[PDB]
Amino acid sequence: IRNYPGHPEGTTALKFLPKTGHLILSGGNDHTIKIWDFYHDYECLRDFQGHNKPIKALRFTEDCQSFLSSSFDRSVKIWDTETGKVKTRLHLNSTPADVESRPTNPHEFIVGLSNSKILHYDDRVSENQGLVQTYDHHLSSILALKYFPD
């Protein structure tokens, strides 16, 4: 019905905020995550990334304060909503095609990889650079995950 030109490069990953969500988070194929609102006056606050490749899977925490982000250069990055200065994960084996955080506690944080090994990262465990435990019962690239909402 009504339009908005966001990301000139092809692919996009548009998602709202959770339940009480006035915001329109995007992060396209032009390696830049961007922020626009539901009020017709579309106001731009660009969360610039650092990592080279385009941004793939973007999702919020239950808190609506930090949103996760996945790229092709083995780089996941957490992102605080308005500020954007925040914990970072530069190093993986290769791209995690899809990522999601816990809908009850923003601390726990699942990342899912092409090699078919899935990874936890709590808040103190993101500080540790560790995992609570991995999953390895899928053998193909998983590219797909979401929590049972409890």
């Binding site: 995992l131 609570v132 435990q133 991995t134």
Partner: protein, 67 residues
């Protein structure tokens, strides 16, 4: 018997009485810990703590056995 050949003083006791310890692992926190485990690790516990404090070990063990 074979892996106890390292040290001969440790006597073996084949129990005639079957004790329920398959269901021992279906205690909540135990199962939890089992699931949690990421690697070759041991995580010991005191299977009964307060009971020891109150009464002798045997008493505690009877309760445990029942459970």
């Amino acid at each position: 018997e074979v892996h106890m050949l390292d040290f001969p003083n440790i006597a073996i006791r084949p129990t005639e009485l079957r004790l329920p310890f398959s269901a021992a692992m279906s205690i909540d926190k135990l199962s939890d810990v089992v699931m949690k485990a990421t690697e070759p690790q041991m995580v010991l516990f005191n299977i009964y703590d307060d009971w020891l404090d109150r009464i002798s070990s045997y008493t505690a063990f009877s309760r445990l056995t029942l459970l």
